[PDB]
């Protein structure tokens, strides 16, 4: 977007919990445009969150998403002819996007048989501070702040 | 997938009928 | 690679079909071939009279061919025998045994096909092409014709390099649908090659 500022799309609220973050996670799970299958996967995963954890799955989901959000990342920049890894903060929308994308990607990396079990286990582990998505967050916050010397290339 | 003759989706893709896709 | 035909661009509004008749899918091609043969034999005989348009209508084995000619005295002949011979050839080619009508064109310098034909005759007589186009556009503009344009294609003046002489004046809004622009195309067969003559005449707005 060069001319305008590219305003953000407003998502419809969730049909169960009434949260737009849940709908965004549904969309990140969605594949080939199958909304019903993605919602089936996510709601069965919510059914798995209970009877495994006494807490309501909405709280677990939100706390896991909060645990996956990275505070700083690192972008490449061409300076003086070379390419440097410059660390800089992250806007909240990009925090949410990276959190949900990493949740889905790390969920599909699990050895669990069907999807709902994968999403449920990944959400639980990310809520209690482990899993592949938290590993991704830690790796990003390592790369960034591992190149602190380039912080004056913030831009 | 859609390239197997002896499947439903195969007959639908090739646009034919047979033992693996009857006409009721 | 641009500038589509204006008549074909306005066939919906401010322009009508030369052939206007209904036919099924089993009869459309035959009646179309018949109309094409009609126009072919017509333009091979009435060119001396300067025919600008040939309209064709069909109801049921009857064709209301109407020829718009600037000089009907040539298509009529002496006492009306020329039209008799032409209707005879019509009934011989197509056994439909139909009639024929002639319409005089007032101010032939407002019908673009006749303007293009005049410029083509001039170019074929080894006339100054620039002066030909200039005088043609002047004659068109000097009688109504809120807009005018005449274009002549390559080999201008028998040159070895193909050129394009523009010589236009007035208002020719081709992109305006309601422009009601009469378009005419003519060829000039010379000893050195072929000359293409296009004529645009703009009249009326709505």
């Amino acid at each position: 977007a060069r001319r305008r500022r590219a305003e953000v799309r407003q998502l419809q609220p969730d049909l169960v919990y009434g949260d737009v973050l849940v709908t965004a996670f549904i969309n990140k799970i969605m594949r080939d445009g199958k909304k019903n299958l993605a919602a089936r996967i996510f709601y069965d995963a919510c059914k798995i969150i209970q009877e495994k954890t006494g807490q309501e799955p909405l709280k677990v989901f939100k706390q896991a998403v909060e645990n996956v959000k990275p505070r700083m990342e690192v972008r490449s920049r061409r300076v003086g002819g070379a390419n440097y890894q410059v660390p800089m903060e992250v806007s909240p929308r990009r925090q949410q996007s990276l959190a949900l994308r990493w949740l889905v990607q790390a969920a599909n990396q699990r050895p669990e048989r069907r999807a709902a079990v994968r999403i449920a286990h990944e959400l639980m582990d990310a809520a209690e501070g482990k899993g592949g998505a938290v590993k991704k967050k830690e790796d990003v916050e390592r790369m960034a702040e591992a190149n602190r010397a380039y912080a004056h290339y913030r831009w | 997938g859609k390239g197997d003759r002896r499947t439903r989706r195969g007959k639908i893709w090739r646009g034919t009928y047979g033992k693996y896709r009857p006409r009721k | 690679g641009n500038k589509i035909h204006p008549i074909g661009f306005r066939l919906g509004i401010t322009r009508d079909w030369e052939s206007r008749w209904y036919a099924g899918k089993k009869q459309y091609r035959h009646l179309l071939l018949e109309d094409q043969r009609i126009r072919g034999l017509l333009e091979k005989e009435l060119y001396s009279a300067g025919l600008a348009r040939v309209d064709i209508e069909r109801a049921a084995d009857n064709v209301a061919v109407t020829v718009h000619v600037a000089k009907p005295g040539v298509v009529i002949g002496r006492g009306g025998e020329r039209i008799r011979v032409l209707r005879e050839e019509l009934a011989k080619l197509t056994g439909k045994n139909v009639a024929l009508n002639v319409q005089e064109v007032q101010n032939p310098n407002l019908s673009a096909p006749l303007v293009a034909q005049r410029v083509a005759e001039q170019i074929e007589r080894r006339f100054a092409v620039r002066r030909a186009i200039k005088q043609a556009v002047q004659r068109v503009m000097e009688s109504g014709a809120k807009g005018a344009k005449v274009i002549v294609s390559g080999r201008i003046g028998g040159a070895e390099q193909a050129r394009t002489e523009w010589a236009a004046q007035g208002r020719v809004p081709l992109h305006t649908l309601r422009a009601n622009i009469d378009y005419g195309f003519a060829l000039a067969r010379t000893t050195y090659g072929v000359l293409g003559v296009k004529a645009y005449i703009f009249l009326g707005e709505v």
Binding site: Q12, L15, K35, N36, R40, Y43 | - | -
Partner: protein
């Protein structure tokens, strides 16, 4: 006695007839959960009622046809909104902020030549 709403979404129509009653919905003679319930967004079609919190004041007879069942759900939403507006105009100021009376004009875009599906340009390599 009866309040009517048309609604439309993505080449789909759904006549909505609101007749005060128990609160059970019928669609094309079938039950609301026998046509739906296998589509998650189905309950969204009943959002207008929850907007006014009636949910038990009106029975619904709906006749839907055209497009797919999701556009049918959204058209049912708009039809219920229109019938509810015809019931009491004072409901308009309650339904306008939620955009339920807003007709969703998103239609499938026409496929164009040169492309694959109306925008997907064919891949090239140049080498």
């Amino acid at each position: 006695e009866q309040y009517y709403g048309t609604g439309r979404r993505k080449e789909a129509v759904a006549r909505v007839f609101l007749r005060p009653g128990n609160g059970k919905v019928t669609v094309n003679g079938q039950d609301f959960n026998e046509y739906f319930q296998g589509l998650v967004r189905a309950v969204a079609a009943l959002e207008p009622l929850r907007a006014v919190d009636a949910l038990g004041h009106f029975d619904a007879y709906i006749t839907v046809r055209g497009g797919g069942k999701s556009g049918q759900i959204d058209a049912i939403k708009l039809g219920i909104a229109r019938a509810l507006v015809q019931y009491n105009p004072d409901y308009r100021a309650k339904l306008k902020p939620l955009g339920f009376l807003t007709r969703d004009a998103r239609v499938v875009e026409r496929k164009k030549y040169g492309k694959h599906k109306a925008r997907r340009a064919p891949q090239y390599s140049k080498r």
